[PDB]
Every structure is written in structure tokens, then in C-alpha cells.
Symmetry: D3
Subunit: 175 residues, 6 copies
């Protein structure tokens, strides 16, 4: 199942991301159920917004919210929910939501999948529009849902992203 996919070939540089939500999709918030490996509908989002990138997680990690760490993956074409993409972390958007600190990593397709993102080595190489769109999305996507909310704290670099990967990988290792 999706439950059995590694965190990565060589974390934190070389990771796999399980996709839950495609870029530019209908506002259905899918989440993989850890017990079954199945894709569940968490909610029908209430704002008229879409994820700027594919959205998913790194398996065999545990963030402080109790779920695997959250990752955005830009691609040339939207990915299928439940698919897995090999990627390389390049930055992280720090934020707190209704449950606490819950960072949003950005990882680009690995060179072996495409050469398109090889020039993106660190967070400053991400397009400014994309970064602003991501920040705006997380600032506002919960605006019409009672008891959900976000404080966006700012962009940090690839080293920071990799530290978060390692930390949440080690957290799951000793659960």
C-alpha cells in the first residue's frame, strides 16, 4: 500500500512525496488514512481557493500536528491523488494553525523525473509569484471554517526544510 512507501531514497536530500490533492483542483481536501492507506475526504473546503501546487506528505514522518509532514510539489501537470513523486526539498513556509506549528515544505521533482527544476536549488530560486500564492492560500483557505485558522510566519531555505524532514522522520522513528 501507500503505507509501505519509504520516506525517501536518501533523506533529506532525496525524498518521496505521497500526493493527496492535485494542484489547481476542486476544493476537496483528501487525506490518506494512516490505518488503511485509503484516500479519505477530510472536508469540502469552504473558500473558493485551490492549492497552488500538488499537496501531500512524506511517509514515515510525524509532525507536531500528529500527521506526516506536509509538502507542496510544483509540477508541469497536476498529479493523481495517491501517486508518489520523487523530489528534492528547496524551502519551507513556516506557520501556525489551530493545532500549532505546521510547516509547509516545498520540494521540486527530482532531476531523474525532469530537468525542469534542477535550477531551483534554494528558496530564493522559487518564483516570487508562486511563493506569494502559497502564502496567500494558507493565510486564507480556512477563513470560512469555524475553528480553523492560520498564522503565516515566513519562508526559510532548503537547509531549514531538510532539518524539518529529519526532525519529523526521527520523531516517527521513536513515535
Amino acid at each position: 500500500s501507500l503505507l509501505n512507501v519509504p520516506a525517501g531514497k536518501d533523506l533529506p536530500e532525496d525524498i518521496y512525496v505521497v500526493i493527496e490533492i492535485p494542484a489547481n483542483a476542486d476544493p476537496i481536501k483528501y487525506e490518506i488514512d494512516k490505518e488503511s492507506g485509503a484516500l479519505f475526504v477530510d472536508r469540502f473546503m469552504s473558500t473558493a481557493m485551490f492549492y497552488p501546487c500538488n499537496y501531500g506528505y512524506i511517509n514515515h514522518t510525524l509532525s507536531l500536528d500528529g500527521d506526516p509532514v506536509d509538502v507542496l510539489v510544483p509540477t508541469p501537470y497536476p498529479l493523481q491523488p495517491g501517486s508518489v513523486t520523487r523530489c528534492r526539498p528547496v524551502g519551507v513556509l513556516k506557520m501556525t494553525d489551530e493545532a500549532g506549528e505546521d510547516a509547509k515544505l516545498v520540494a521540486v521533482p527530482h532531476s531523474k523525473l525532469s530537468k525542469e527544476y534542477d535550477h531551483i536549488k534554494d528558496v530564493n530560486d522559487l518564483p516570487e509569484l508562486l511563493k506569494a500564492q502559497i502564502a496567500h492560500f494558507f493565510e486564507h483557505y480556512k477563513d470560512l471554517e469555524k475553528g480553523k485558522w492560520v498564522k503565516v510566519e515566513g519562508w526559510e531555505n532548503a537547509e531549514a526544510a531538510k532539518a524539518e524532514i529529519v526532525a519529523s522522520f526521527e520523531r516517527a522513528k521513536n513515535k
Copy 2:
């Protein structure tokens, strides 16, 4: 796998539905294979019709046709085949087909997924057009397939739907 998803958090009021066919999709009749949990193509439907709602089943139930009980789930946006949605039963369309009585439950997204359907408490709260579309779909979707056919028997309420859930859950329990 999808094989391991509960029938519900608290049946029959609070159920999970495994989706096989999205609303308003191409006429591919997918079915989950009970042995593998994989999505198989049962047939390419022959009429130029689409399911008015997402279509799927409640796991760990057994109807008289030998399959898990059939459920229609209206949503704001079509769901992915193989995904699972938490729902609440609100009515049932009774019918017989070429194999016998094989009712079609209607269950709406659970309040925790959306508030949109909370006002739908019983079958009379479903839109009349939607109910008529569902009835017409099942009356006609087999019209061009030899040895497939339907007799639609009528709409019944949420209590009737819940009774069917319990009955087919208990049937699977002792198989």
C-alpha cells in the same frame, strides 16, 4: 487497502462510503474487486447516461445481490474513484434488477465534512429534481444491455435506509 475501511464510525447513522464511480463521469462502470481491493472495469455502459451522484458502497456489508450495499452520495464536486467519504443516510430508492432486490441508498456528506447537507434530514428534503434523475437513471441505464434490466419500486425514508444498512451489515457479519 480499501478492503480494511470500516463500514462506519457509528453505523447506521455515521457511515463510510467507498466511491467507485464519480458523479457526471464518463460511462465506465468501475467496481472494487473484493479479493484484491483494486478498481476493476465491470463494463463500458451502453446508454448515453451518467450517475447523478457519486456511486459506491459501504464496506463490510453484503446485500442480496452478493455485493456490498449500493450508495449514492451527492457532493459539490465529483469524488475520485477509490476514495472514501464519511456520510449520513437520508433515503433509499427501492428497486429490483436482473438479479433481484437491490436498493440504492442516498447518503449525504457528514457535517464534519461540510455543513451544506445538514438541512437534509430525510428523503423529503432531497431535491425533487435529483430524486427524479436518480429514479430515471436506474430505470434506463440498462436499456441497451441484454440481460440487464430494472424495476424501480419507490423512495423510502431515512429510517428505511438505516434498516437496510443494518441488515446488510449483519448479513456480512455472518456471511
Copy 3:
């Protein structure tokens, strides 16, 4: 999982094909990972081309490239990645790529799924345009990827396709 799906009800005449890529889709080359059964992104294809048919494989087979044997399945509407379709082999396009001989079977939906393809009994019954499109696709889809390439060797009949099925089924049987 998809790992547990038979090669066929009655190979080589009656087979199942696990779909990885839909017909006429975005240029994402998905592949099922044999370890996990999950759909991985192999690459983002570099040419502006699409598969003329759904593309996938027969489980529990092993071709000389180390993967299960490759199958194209024409359908009236594109199939979902990760779904399984019952089919009947009708021809094969022989070719060598950067790793060696790696034939592309064509199998049509089984009569039980549709009557649409029953008249296609052998390779000469496939539409000429479709065959030419398939040949052209494999001749060119790697043209912009370094270290990937193809030599198309020609169309052969249904008996040849069935021989390839049996051979790669027997190869996996003794791995």
C-alpha cells in the same frame, strides 16, 4: 493491492491489464512500484505527445526489461490510473529501446465489458490510423530524452502477442 491481481482469468486469451497511464492524458509517465503497489511518477515526458491508448501491464509477468509486459488498451473513454481491465490480446508492436527488446501488446476490452471490440480478432482488424499513431508515438516519444531511444521493428498478430504473454508469464513464474 494491485500486487495481488491475477495475470488473467485464462491466459493468454483472457487477461487483466493494470492501467498506469490513460489515453490522451498529460505527459506524466506513471509506473506501478512492484514493492509497494503504489503509482509512482517515473518521469515527466519531454515531448509534446500522448499515449494513443491506455497504457499498462499484465501483473505476474516479467519481460526482458525487468518489468511486466507492456500493454496498450483502446477504450471508448480513458481509464483511471491504477484500475484493472479485462481484455483480449489482438496484436503486438515489436521494438527495441535503450534497454533491449520491449514489445508493446495491444489488447481490447473483453466482450463481457463491451461488444464494441468483438469484431477485432487480429492485428489487421485494428484501425490503420491507430496502429500508425502507436508506431509513431513509440518512434518519437523519447526523442528529447538523453539515453532513451527506440527502434520500431513492426506489427505482428494475435498469436505472436499471446506467445509473448505466455513467455513472460513463464519467465516470472521462475523469475
Copy 4:
């Protein structure tokens, strides 16, 4: 505008069809307004059905219902509403609806657009499934609309189709 498009290069053998509704589309019944040439929504159809082919009309014709003659055009991929396709008539489905006799021509893409349909010379060469789907569609698409209804009278050949073209062209000529 679309108002100024010829009926055909060489009617009735060589015609243009203005497309109003794509094949396999959402149930929005678009119609070109004769005054403005704009695409208007006639209605949101009430049954869960789709047109088996693109649907439109031959400009500068007048059928007995007061509109230009109705044409179905099968294509490999759905056409855009408001686009124009060169075609060749091959058959006609005779029927009466709530307003009277209102035949449905079938015309295939002209050889200059594609070779795919050149083998379809007359109504017997159309696929049987497609013809049955068209007949079933018109028999049922008005089933949930009060004061709309259909009596399907049967398939006739290409000569009959061409006669209808000429007759409605001549009708518009002297309005």
C-alpha cells in the same frame, strides 16, 4: 458571424455543421440565436444524459420546427460550441417531438478533415451501438420535462438525409 457561414461547399454532399453542443458534455442545451449569432442557453436538461455525438445544425436551412436542420457529427474528440465542421451526410433518424417531425441527421467529418470516416458511406456503416445510443438518447432525454416528448420513427439512409438537407435549404431560400 456564425450567421454568415454557408450551408455547404456543395450541398447536400458537402456541408458545414455549426456545433452547438459537444459530444459527452454537461447537460447544457445551447442554441445559436438566429438574430445575434450568439450561443444561448436554451435549458439545463433534466435527465442524466449526454449527446452521443456533437450536435448542431446546417446554417441557411429551415426545418418544420422553425429552426435549421439538426445534425449529429461523430468526431474523435469533442468539438467546441460555436465551431464549424465540414461533413458528409450518411443517414437520418426520423422522429416527431412536441412540435412535430424533426429529424436528426448524421454527418461524418469530410475526408479533407480526416480519413477516419471515409469508410462510412451509408447508414448501415455507422456502428450499431452508436445508432442505438442516438435513438435511445432522443427517446428519453425529454422524459423529465413537462411538455417536451419524442416519438422515434426509425433510421433512413444517406439519400434520405440528403433529401432532407435539400428540402430544408429550399425552405429557407423562400422562407
Copy 5:
């Protein structure tokens, strides 16, 4: 052309709306050019948002921003840009943007197109979620565009909507 479409059969009760942007579409802000009647790209919107309803205007009106009055039209399925739908006004969202007061009417499909919206007689009958989504959309869709901004002032009823229609119709009449 679209330039020649009436404001309505019987304004302000019975209007036509020219659609520029479909509901739930990609973030391309199309606008009809008054000179040519063609659909121009005004901009590629910068936030990750979509219009909750189809969006367009009433022809032969002039609002204070210099364009025809703006209308949102909910439908069961998204409409084609450049198409025209007969509708009935039911409410208005008052707001000011970077150019001044520029209200957003809501008009539902006319009864002759569908019975689905007949129960919506006034603004209080619109779903609360939809109204909140519309308000949130206009509050935020310009958030990442320099020199574009919005102050949302509040919902008013069908009479207010009709007054705005009449006022901008009369404004265009004497330009």
C-alpha cells in the same frame, strides 16, 4: 455578435447575462471587448482563487466603472465564455474597488431554463455558504495585485438588484 444581444426580454425582472468567466475555472480573467465583441484576456489573476459562480454582464448597461453591470449566475454546470443565459435577479453584493462602487449582482437561471432556482426569490433564499464564498472571493481576489483592491459593503435584496439594473440600463441609454 455579442454586441447585439438585448439587455433582457423584460428588464429588470427578465434579463440576459453574457458570460465571461465560468464558475470554478482557471484564473483567467476574460472580458468582452466592447468594440469588437471578442473575448479578451484582461489578466491572469494572481491569487489561487476561482469565481464561485459564472461571471459576466448585462449588455447595453453602463455602470460607474465604465463597463456593463457585473452579474454572477449560479448554474448546475459551468457555462461557456461568450454564451448568454436568461436569468432573474435575486440580490446584490455592494462593494467599492480601486475604481469606485461596482456592485456584483446575483441572478439565477430563468424558470424556462430550469425549475431548480424558482424557489430562490430573494437574497435570503441564496445559500449562506455561496453568499459567504462570493463575499470572500471579492474581498481577496485582488490581494496580490498592486493597485487593485476591494471594500465589500454588504448584501442587498432583489429590489436593490433590480434598481441597479434599471439605473445602469438608463445610464447607457443616454451614455
Copy 6:
């Protein structure tokens, strides 16, 4: 109509492009008919290829093939056939086809539509993958059509593109 759209606000720097074919679309080759301004189907393309960018023309120009000059426009999301986008030329792919020299301009969305392409000032700033995809597309898209063919001659800069615009604008001016 589309017939009445200017070549540009300030040619050759500031142009309008009428879109005929969206990026990444089905293989329907639409063309605007100069007489009617309507979108006609020229052909159903025979290779399994798609245009890497939106494709269209500059109105009120005449190239040596007798049609207005051909332009590719990259956008974040595909454009609607028949829509018009303001753009800025940045390069040109020179080639000859079955009718003669028939260059393919590349023009990016004008700064007023988006800031995304402002950094693309000349042909060397276009992504290498995109340029290679465009070249490969034109080298191969006619490979399965008798009496259609292409010789790609190479990329030239923005000044060359602008010269071609001016030349074909002046050609149409004196027809």
C-alpha cells in the same frame, strides 16, 4: 467579430494574438475563417501530439502562406479558442512546410496581463525545454499526413520576430 480586432496597440512591440488552439489540447486543428470570423475545424491531426503553447495569429497580417502570421503564446493556463491575448514578441522559429516559409513566432503575455513573463526579453530567455518541444512538435506533427511536411530552420531573436510582424502587417496593408 474577431475580424475587427487590431493587429496590436503598438506593433510590433505590443500585439494581439487571436487564439485558435489551446496548449495541451485534443488534436483538433481549428482555424478562423477569414470570411466569417468563425472557428472552423481544419483537420483532426493524425499524430498523437499537442501544441506546447496556445496557438493562433495576429489579425490584419498576411504571411507568404496566405494566412495571418502564426504565433505561439505560453500561458499559465490554456486559453479559449477564439479569445484574444495581448502579448510581446520574444523569438521566432524559422521553418518551411509544404507550402513554403512559414515561421512560428513566440510572444509572451504582456506585462499588464501578468508579470510572470516580464523576465523573458529575448529568445535565449525562453526555457530550453519549451523551445525544444516546439521545434520537435513542428518537426513531427505532420508525419502521418500525406502532402504535409516540415523543415525546421532554427530559432531567431526578438528583433527577427518583430521584423516578421512588420513585414506581414505591411503585406496585408497592400494585400
